[PDB]
Design a binder for this molecule. Sequence first.
Ligand SMILES: Nc1ccn([C@@H]2O[C@H](COP(=O)(O)OP(=O)(O)OP(=O)(O)O)[C@@H](O)[C@H]2O)c(=O)n1
Ligand SMILES: Nc1ccn([C@@H]2O[C@H](COP(=O)(O)OP(=O)(O)OP(=O)(O)O)[C@@H](O)[C@H]2O)c(=O)n1
Ligand SMILES: Nc1ccn([C@@H]2O[C@H](COP(=O)(O)OP(=O)(O)OP(=O)(O)O)[C@@H](O)[C@H]2O)c(=O)n1
Ligand SMILES: Nc1ccn([C@@H]2O[C@H](COP(=O)(O)OP(=O)(O)OP(=O)(O)O)[C@@H](O)[C@H]2O)c(=O)n1
Ligand SMILES: Nc1ccn([C@@H]2O[C@H](COP(=O)(O)OP(=O)(O)OP(=O)(O)O)[C@@H](O)[C@H]2O)c(=O)n1
Ligand SMILES: Nc1ccn([C@@H]2O[C@H](COP(=O)(O)OP(=O)(O)OP(=O)(O)O)[C@@H](O)[C@H]2O)c(=O)n1
Ligand SMILES: [Mg+2]
Ligand SMILES: [Mg+2]
Ligand SMILES: [Mg+2]
Ligand SMILES: [Mg+2]
Ligand SMILES: [Mg+2]
Ligand SMILES: [Mg+2]
Ligand SMILES: [Mg+2]
Ligand SMILES: [Mg+2]
Ligand SMILES: [Mg+2]
Ligand SMILES: [Mg+2]
Ligand SMILES: [Mg+2]
Ligand SMILES: [Mg+2]
Ligand code: NI
Ligand code: NI
Ligand code: NI
Ligand code: NI
Ligand code: NI
Ligand code: NI
Lengths: 254, 254, 254, 254, 254, 254
Amino acid sequence: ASKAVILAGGLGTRLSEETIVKPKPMVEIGGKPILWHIMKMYSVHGIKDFIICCGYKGYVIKEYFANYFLHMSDVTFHMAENRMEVHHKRVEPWNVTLVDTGDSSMTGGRLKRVAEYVKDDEAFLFTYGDGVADLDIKATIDFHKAHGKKATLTATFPPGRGALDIQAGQVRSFQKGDGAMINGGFFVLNPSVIDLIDNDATTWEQEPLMTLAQQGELMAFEHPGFWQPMDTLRDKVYLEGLWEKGKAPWKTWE
Amino acid sequence: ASKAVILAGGLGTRLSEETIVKPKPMVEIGGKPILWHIMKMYSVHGIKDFIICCGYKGYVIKEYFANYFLHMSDVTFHMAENRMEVHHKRVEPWNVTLVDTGDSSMTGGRLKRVAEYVKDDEAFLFTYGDGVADLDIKATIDFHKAHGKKATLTATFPPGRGALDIQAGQVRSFQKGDGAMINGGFFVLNPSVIDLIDNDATTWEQEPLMTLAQQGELMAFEHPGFWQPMDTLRDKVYLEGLWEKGKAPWKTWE
Amino acid sequence: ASKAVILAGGLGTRLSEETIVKPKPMVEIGGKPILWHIMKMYSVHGIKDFIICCGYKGYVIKEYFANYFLHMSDVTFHMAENRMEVHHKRVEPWNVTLVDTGDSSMTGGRLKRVAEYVKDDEAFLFTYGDGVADLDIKATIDFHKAHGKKATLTATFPPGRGALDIQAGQVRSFQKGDGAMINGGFFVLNPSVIDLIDNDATTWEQEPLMTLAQQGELMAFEHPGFWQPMDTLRDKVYLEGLWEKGKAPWKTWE
Amino acid sequence: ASKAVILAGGLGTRLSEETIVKPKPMVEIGGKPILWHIMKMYSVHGIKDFIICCGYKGYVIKEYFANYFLHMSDVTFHMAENRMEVHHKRVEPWNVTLVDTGDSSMTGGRLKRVAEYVKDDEAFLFTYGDGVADLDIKATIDFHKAHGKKATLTATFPPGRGALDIQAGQVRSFQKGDGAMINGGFFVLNPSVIDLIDNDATTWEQEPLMTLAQQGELMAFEHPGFWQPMDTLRDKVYLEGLWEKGKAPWKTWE
Amino acid sequence: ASKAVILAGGLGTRLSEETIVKPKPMVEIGGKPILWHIMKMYSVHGIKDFIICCGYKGYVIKEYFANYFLHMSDVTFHMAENRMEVHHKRVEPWNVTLVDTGDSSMTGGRLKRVAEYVKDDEAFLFTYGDGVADLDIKATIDFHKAHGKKATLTATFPPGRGALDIQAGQVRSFQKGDGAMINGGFFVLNPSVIDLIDNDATTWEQEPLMTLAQQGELMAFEHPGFWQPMDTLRDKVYLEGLWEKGKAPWKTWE
Amino acid sequence: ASKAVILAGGLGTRLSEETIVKPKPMVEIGGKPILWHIMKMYSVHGIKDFIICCGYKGYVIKEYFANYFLHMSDVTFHMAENRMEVHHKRVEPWNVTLVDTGDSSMTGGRLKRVAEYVKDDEAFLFTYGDGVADLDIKATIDFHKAHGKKATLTATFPPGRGALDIQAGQVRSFQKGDGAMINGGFFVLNPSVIDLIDNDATTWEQEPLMTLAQQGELMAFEHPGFWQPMDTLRDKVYLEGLWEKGKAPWKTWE
Ligand SMILES: Nc1ccn([C@@H]2O[C@H](COP(=O)(O)OP(=O)(O)OP(=O)(O)O)[C@@H](O)[C@H]2O)c(=O)n1
Ligand SMILES: Nc1ccn([C@@H]2O[C@H](COP(=O)(O)OP(=O)(O)OP(=O)(O)O)[C@@H](O)[C@H]2O)c(=O)n1
Ligand SMILES: Nc1ccn([C@@H]2O[C@H](COP(=O)(O)OP(=O)(O)OP(=O)(O)O)[C@@H](O)[C@H]2O)c(=O)n1
Ligand SMILES: Nc1ccn([C@@H]2O[C@H](COP(=O)(O)OP(=O)(O)OP(=O)(O)O)[C@@H](O)[C@H]2O)c(=O)n1
Ligand SMILES: Nc1ccn([C@@H]2O[C@H](COP(=O)(O)OP(=O)(O)OP(=O)(O)O)[C@@H](O)[C@H]2O)c(=O)n1
Ligand SMILES: Nc1ccn([C@@H]2O[C@H](COP(=O)(O)OP(=O)(O)OP(=O)(O)O)[C@@H](O)[C@H]2O)c(=O)n1
Ligand SMILES: [Mg+2]
Ligand SMILES: [Mg+2]
Ligand SMILES: [Mg+2]
Ligand SMILES: [Mg+2]
Ligand SMILES: [Mg+2]
Ligand SMILES: [Mg+2]
Ligand SMILES: [Mg+2]
Ligand SMILES: [Mg+2]
Ligand SMILES: [Mg+2]
Ligand SMILES: [Mg+2]
Ligand SMILES: [Mg+2]
Ligand SMILES: [Mg+2]
Ligand code: NI
Ligand code: NI
Ligand code: NI
Ligand code: NI
Ligand code: NI
Ligand code: NI
């Protein structure tokens, strides 16, 4: 397991403020697209080979990687001599495959698209281009191993927009408790699982996932820590804010 | 206890699509402002005396009640004789006090504004102009009674945008469980509680509420049923959809 | 035949610039809602009894008629004595029934709604709240009479956004010619036709109309003259422009 | 001199944020339309008779005055008995004439419209529905008297978005100085001046005013104090802010 | 005749939803800018030399062609070695000249701009960057030949937003008939025609075209088939829809 | 003195119409970003070395310089041979350093960022990426020299949205007069001045500048001529208009 599949084909409707100009994962935190953070999460854990399921506004990502250095460092232009000098040429020990998974495909359909990429894989990683966390991807991987089932997902606690501490009908305090976790993406999967995807129209979180669960083939890796998606403006700002203040839990690297 | 205090002073930022023209509670479900539904929830339970904390775009509510019949029935105009004939003149055994609680006041500040209205009250009811439920307001009231503490709130389950069934690290199914409830408004309160509100700038959900909890003065009425707020467009549509289909749980009346 | 049924329940999507605040027919030309013009077209022809199928933003119309005089004349307020003095109290020998035909109903469904209003009618008139013309409604009526069939529609020439004069493959000039007319609304109808409407979901221009045609029950009254709808901004402006310049063909009255 | 003519027919383009729903002068400060403040400025000085040149979105003003009390006080509805009880019925010793000065008229054209209203007047007052000040309207009036010329305007200092203190090429400090005033509206005028307005298309600030100046018929009343217009959002907020903080210089009354 | 001149300088006002970020012809169908489709229509017919009259947002097109391969295929980045590997490098046997025809120029003015490009041409092709069709460009060309006149245009049937079948005042059915065609662009022209263009301000569809017609120099090539422009959102969606479903008549190639 | 520091990190709030897609200085006049004009102003005066304080949407500038030639000339693509041929390869004898001065930094903070760039400088130039003028930068430079103080700023006359000619209370005419100038940017400065900037949060126009003035270290270079910023749409259009008409005072070059 060394490859990570990342969804980046959505419309970003709930974040049009930005998405009208680019694909929601191309949206930044700390001047860096969220996708990059996520990929930084992987790398930190050994995953340096990615596949990106592009769709709505893909060229944006294409261009991103196509001019990464620029995107990444200061620069000087010696125009008189038509010369470009990037101050910092930082290298990423990555491999990036950008795939047009279709304009109208769903999560399943898209994933199903990039099979060949991970077919012979012992296993591969799959997640959303909208969530960051201080997740221990490795750990997840070994867990998916330990258990041997086709799929592993990361269960997380959600962010709450009025969670309580109630004991004996008495509110003890204003703070999820126990059977209160959700699917935060970060899947560990079996190529074999693609068989579940019927077509482009497939919403991975429907049959595929449901069936797997029903199939006793669905495991949940519990993450108590930091996890946060970005679906709205407030989502951004918050993350933006965390980052400014040197408080980006998800920031597991140098 | 016979009076209900309803907040209607917010900006409705997350629903500007509608709020640019009116106050978020003036937004409708089934052609009726959500406030009306809520008031319909009360009435159904015996509360026919209300106080409305107006603020952002208050005149809208003013006008609403000022021309209710019209708002409510078909009508014929015999213009030649400058005559207006409302088909249906439906009467509400209500009493409505619309109060300008200030343009910049918070939840606490606003409530604090309308004290005089409920000062001599054994107790009064307080909620948000954004949530509907099949709530048994009466029951809550007797519970607040039974317990005698200054405040009662309704604990509810939230609506989830990926809740799981996990047993022994195995995802059993995709569905809150136990210590998974939230504050859904619908408060039963002690006039005495206003003492907690410092000023217009008070966010009721801060000191007042927190202190009450900390004070061992905060009770929680558990509601397992139907509860839904409206903060966004999707929120509306859903509620709109429920309503069309003759599926408005909150609809506890004729 | 003395009653006119006018649709006013649409969303006005293509004219949101205005429709976000009111129902598209409440949009004005010469400071007067387009509906009014249309009703002015009828009156001019003897129709002074109307039924309005309200839906999206109906209260706007309600209010319109409810405060017509105001809407229509200058005014003085002697506030010190809380007195309102409308300069001009112009009377319309009309009768206006405003009916909530539902938020989600279609053209058929809506019409079907207001049956009772025109059931015993020899015949009634039906049109859209979006089109004006120098139409000779009377003439249409007698024609619908002459022919005796259940329905009459007004065939018109459309407005063109690059119509040519081509003879022997040669463009003679830049100017519809012959089998080039459209349905411009302005229907003359048989109560009996409602039987064709299946439900609220009915789009009158589908089965009802089609079936009538197919049924050899559909007649077309040909209008060569002035006809113009308002679906967009440009539509408005144009009409606005026509009006300024004392050039509103549709203006068939004093 | 006892009548004041106030322009309220503009499009409010630079404040669409609000103007899409109402005429810019109907925009509020302290929950009160700016027009009201202005009229409050007059009253404070003895002017209790006004004429309002309506145009873009006039009905809004119509309605405003038509339901002033409501607009102005809290209220209770005894719906069961279809009764409305306004807490505070505050009376204004005013007289208000709302005049449709046309949708497309300019400043001159509009004013020219309401002649009859001030023809026999010794003199009348004329200003914009966008500016507030601690202006001493009386003083202006006596000045216009003292001088006897046809027109008086109020010269004011503008609000600056980087004004300096420069002496001998040295910036002494960051703060208008001397021949640095502008026209802030608040005109004192001679009915006779209308003769200058050619038509609806007249922009008062063009021939009329220019000619008057050129004619040696234009006087300037100098106001050093507080003066502020509202053309943008920031304009509002500022004024809003001033008001909150009990800092509304223009507030010359009880 | 081997060169095609394509207009791409408009503002795209009626499609701002997209045009705010790019020039309307850069808008896509099937992930490909509409311009590309059009050019694909030409190529299919032998035209592989184009001139593009850029204006509003030209750089977008510049960039498009500048990174076509990328725009066109999947890709892999071996960042560690700063390497870019486009999966598919598809070659177009084209030649593309992108010309800034000015920000404010009209159709005539723009065309007039690119004379030199087609001066010595026997003849050249000229059309809009907004329309697709299953047009037989060749055929048109030979027709323009056959006839020898300076200009040929393609006459087409328009798309109708309520076209009827009326015989003897009876609506036979709901479906243009005969002298019902329009100018759908796709012009075949004589360099000589540029002489008609007076300046940048020229709207080709005014004097130039009119004069040609009047001059007995204007021929019309009749196209009964598929023709569709894109001026609005709905226009897109439709085309988008056609394309999905493997139904893009205009798609005359591999 | 040979280096110019130009701010380009703002949000461009008052010009979102354009700024939603790019940084306000990337906005064009005559198809060229305003920054370019400004840099053209410098060059004209001998300044061909620049530093750009990027922030909000910096990549836009990066890309601008990265593909300048393209941005600047017509071009031909010989796609069949994947060849790009820029018609005009115009060289600028410049040097351009693009620096990410931070997303949230202020004017001071940003400048403070690029110290190293001008530390050993006798002196350097500093201005805004929003203003053009027919300024004699050289002259300013020699003046800053002549005087020897740490800072020089350009005092200018502002553009007025109703400036008068008042003598003896009489308005002579409608036209700033004397102690009526403002800070128009175009600073000449002493590296030493950076010591005044406390951090990224510094608004240069606060302590730094104020202190300098207070310090008797602030000189003002008086510019009577043409000066114009671009903060709004109207600002653009005007400048756009000036440019069309061959009337761009600021245009001091070939
Ligand atoms: N058809 C779809 C739907 C989603 N995604 C991806 O799945 C992730 C999560 O989607 P989510 O943010 O919840 O929805 P969006 O499509 O991104 O936008 P919206 O706010 O409209 O739901 C994102 O990386 C999105 O790009 C995708 O590639 N294809
Ligand atoms: N200062 C405030 C804040 C809120 N409310 C009321 O409190 C309820 C819940 O507020 P909520 O919907 O969560 O926030 P809003 O202010 O309504 O709008 P936004 O989306 O911007 O949060 C609503 O009845 C709102 O009118 C209020 O009267 N005054
Ligand atoms: N469900 C519907 C659809 C239309 N209409 C009415 O039918 C007429 C013509 O509709 P049209 O203007 O073509 O569509 P709209 O609904 O008005 O708006 P849109 O631009 O989104 O098509 C209008 O009087 C509209 O109010 C209606 O009452 N109910
Ligand atoms: N044709 C016009 C123009 C202006 N006014 C009035 O003149 C005043 C000042 O106009 P101003 O605010 O400067 O312009 P607006 O028309 O209001 O809007 P915009 O921002 O588009 O300039 C306002 O009371 C406006 O209502 C008017 O009645 N008729
Ligand atoms: N001054 C103009 C006008 C139009 N066109 C081009 O002519 C074609 C047809 O124009 P049309 O779509 O009808 O108008 P647009 O300018 O594109 O936009 P709008 O909706 O505002 O009319 C398009 O390729 C447009 O780019 C152009 O180059 N220059
Ligand atoms: N934090 C800031 C503020 C301003 N600037 C730059 O300072 C100049 C002048 O700023 P101004 O136009 O007045 O404000 P903006 O930030 O550009 O936008 P807004 O309209 O929101 O004020 C511009 O070159 C802007 O890019 C900057 O780099 N950083
Ligand atoms: Mg989604
Ligand atoms: Mg998401
Ligand atoms: Mg809130
Ligand atoms: Mg809420
Ligand atoms: Mg419709
Ligand atoms: Mg229509
Ligand atoms: Mg104006
Ligand atoms: Mg103004
Ligand atoms: Mg056009
Ligand atoms: Mg077009
Ligand atoms: Mg700024
Ligand atoms: Mg500025
Ligand atoms: Ni270098
Ligand atoms: Ni009656
Ligand atoms: Ni009177
Ligand atoms: Ni009472
Ligand atoms: Ni490779
Ligand atoms: Ni070449």
